[PDB]
Design a protein around this ligand. Structure first.
Ligand SMILES: Nc1nc2c(ncn2[C@H]2CC[C@@H](COP(=O)(O)OP(=O)(O)OP(=O)(O)O)O2)c(=O)[nH]1
Ligand SMILES: [Cl-]
Ligand SMILES: [Cl-]
Ligand SMILES: [Cl-]
Ligand SMILES: [Cl-]
Ligand SMILES: [Mg+2]
Ligand SMILES: [Zn+2]
Length: 562
DNA sequence: CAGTATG
DNA sequence: GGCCATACTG
């Protein structure tokens, strides 16, 4: 998947050019070029070899750039990127890539204290600015390393589907699933753990490695193999035989924590659970399929997302396995963005998208101004009017007229009451001073929670993955205040951010609280990231009950007043 | 070969 | 650290 390879090269030029001080319109132009190119689904292979006017249908794309997608896909390299690299060390680049730093600051620092690489930094670090801004940099350095090479799930997912077809449709591959971290729907992944049911695996493994998505081979076999892709990632393979495919799936999905409560049950029940089967003596009492095993250990098939050793095993033993949301059930997205703000879409495009998707509704929750220091209280009203007066010049689904409203530090909101009144949906989510002590930052959220027009609490922790640690608050008390005001909480399925995450999502929902689900979609493709959130719901043990997205337009609306 | 790391 | 099968070091 070399759409990364390109979007990579864009953002690079951006960062150097920005650093060097050239035109800021070209500059953002690249950043946005990469940001769609990274999150496309279909491949550039094609439209590259399909003329240019179809290539510019992609948002952010144009001529000046177009002639670079030439330079690249057509002719290989990128002349400007070279010329920039010539003037700007990779040393220094890694300095911008440091969260907190970034071009300007990076320049500042370089002309300030000749800082030109990471070690250069780390030293200086150990000795305008501010002593927070500086310790903010440290914090970044950390997450940088601390996160380190683990990727977010959706940043690869369609690529792990990409493979699975490829793997299934090899010769000598009867069945095959993606397992491990990805099948468990954990927010972050380290590697793709695959399984393959095969008698003859030395045509499996042998031709596994021979796939066009491989850079380097690291390990071969006849029952297994490791690979390090062109993109960076590691995908393993295991090859249990057909009679065992079920235990195969179990072992290769784990988790370690979960698979250990399991094997223990086999022990204390006179049995032996492996990656091959479950046994009494040499007789395999299960393996053929995965339920057929779980049933063999006296349990009701547990869902990957629950496989953590956090309750699932215990609850299985009473039939008390909870009822979970399913992608089927979701009747709408509850945060997307249009061209009234950072979104890239007209409303038609957004509509048509929700239709094919098969939603009953959709909120077009653009941003209040407390973000790009658009829309104005007035342009808010007009927007609402355009929407409402758009709504009835079209069928269903129904575009709710909504807004992601910033919280002010005091806890006041970023539009006024007077506006809020006219909205269908009211999101609220911080984008500002993320680091105040837990319980003063807790005031803030409660102080936000005081307004009664407030519907959802959007991407609550502000967590940007590998870029910003969650924010710090007494959630205990927050969701408390949100239960007792009829206020919902968001799972934001966008891959780079997943507020609410698994462990907070569970807590809340099982505090009595409702839940909003969304993709924060800024381009049409981003809608796909729904099940990402549903997946993450399921892991927080959540049923369709008390999920605003599982209501129907009307009902929801009804709820929206009460 | 056992002893240890590893998925 | 509670598991059970394997591949690598020695
Ligand atoms: N029985 C047993 N199985 C294990 C052990 N360690 C790992 N496994 C299984 C469970 C998960 C599976 C896949 O390997 P990974 O750890 O790479 O995958 P993951 O656990 O989902 O997370 P990630 O892919 O991000 O690492 O290997 C162990 O000590 N015993
Ligand atoms: Cl985690
Ligand atoms: Cl339904
Ligand atoms: Cl007011
Ligand atoms: Cl009113
Ligand atoms: Mg692994
Ligand atoms: Zn947002």
């Amino acid at each position: 998947m070399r759409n990364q390879e390109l979007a990579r090269i864009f953002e690079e030029i951006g960062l150097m050019s920005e650093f060097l001080g050239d035109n800021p319109f070209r500059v953002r132009a690249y950043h946005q070029a990469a940001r769609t190119l990274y999150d496309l689904d279909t491949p550039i292979e094609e439209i590259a070899e399909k003329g240019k006017e179809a290539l510019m249908e992609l948002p952010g794309v144009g001529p000046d750039l177009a002639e670079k997608i030439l330079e690249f896909l057509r002719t290989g390299k990128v002349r400007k990127h070279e010329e920039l690299s010539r003037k700007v060390p990779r040393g220094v680049l890694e300095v911008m890539e440091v969260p907190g730093v970034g071009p300007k600051t990076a320049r500042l620092l370089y002309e300030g204290l000749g800082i030109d690489s990471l070690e250069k930094l780390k030293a200086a670090l150990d000795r305008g600015f501010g002593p927070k801004r500086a310790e903010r940099i440290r914090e970044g350095l950390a997450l940088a390393q601390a996160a380190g090479k683990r990727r977010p799930l959706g940043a690869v997912l369609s690529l792990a589907r990409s493979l699975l077809e490829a793997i299934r449709a090899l010769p000598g591959v009867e069945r095959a699933e993606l397992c491990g971290s990805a099948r468990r729907y954990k927010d972050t992944v380290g590697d793709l753990d695959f399984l393959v049911a095969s008698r003859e695996g030395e045509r499996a493994v042998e031709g596994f490695v021979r796939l066009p998505q491989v850079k380097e081979v690291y390990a071969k076999g006849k029952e297994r193999a490791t690979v390090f892709l062109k993109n960076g990632l590691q995908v393993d393979l295991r090859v249990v035989p057909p009679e065992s495919y079920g235990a195969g799936l179990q072992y290769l999905t784990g988790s370690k924590a979960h698979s250990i409560r399991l094997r223990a049950l086999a022990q204390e029940k006179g049995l032996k659970l492996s990656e091959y089967g479950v046994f009494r003596g040499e007789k395999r009492i299960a393996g053929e399929t995965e339920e057929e095993v779980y049933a063999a250990l006296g349990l009701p098939w547990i869902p990957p997302p629950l496989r953590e050793d956090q309750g699932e095993v215990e609850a299985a033993l009473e039939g008390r396995l909870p009822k979970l949301l399913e992608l089927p059930q979701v009747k709408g997205d509850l945060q997307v963005h249009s061209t009234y703000s950072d979104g890239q879409n007209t409303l038609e495009e957004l509509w048509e998208a929700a239709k094919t998707m098969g939603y009953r509704y959709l909120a077009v929750t653009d941003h209040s101004p407390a973000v790009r220091v658009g829309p104005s209280p007035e342009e808010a009203l007009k927007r609402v009017g355009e929407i409402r007066r758009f709504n009835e010049t079209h069928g269903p689904p129904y575009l709710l007229a909504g807004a992601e409203v910033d919280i002010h530090p005091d806890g006041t909101l970023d539009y006024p009451d007077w506006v809020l009144r006219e909205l269908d949906l009211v999101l609220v989510s911080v984008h500002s001073r993320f680091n105040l002590p837990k319980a003063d930052q807790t005031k803030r959220l409660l102080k936000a929670l005081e307004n009664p027009f407030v519907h959802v609490l959007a991407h609550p922790t502000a967590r940007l993955l590998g870029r910003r640690a969650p924010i710090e608050a007494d959630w205990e008390a927050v969701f408390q205040k949100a239960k007792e005001k009829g206020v919902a909480v968001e799972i934001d399925g966008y891959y780079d951010r997943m507020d609410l995450p698994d462990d907070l999502a569970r807590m809340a929902y099982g505090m009595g609280l409702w839940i909003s689900l969304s993709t924060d979609a800024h381009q049409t493709d981003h809608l796909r990231f729904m099940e990402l959130a549903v997946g993450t719901a399921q892991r927080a043990w959540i049923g369709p009950e008390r999920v605003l997205n599982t209501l129907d337009y009307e009902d929801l609306l009804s709820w929206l007043k009460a």
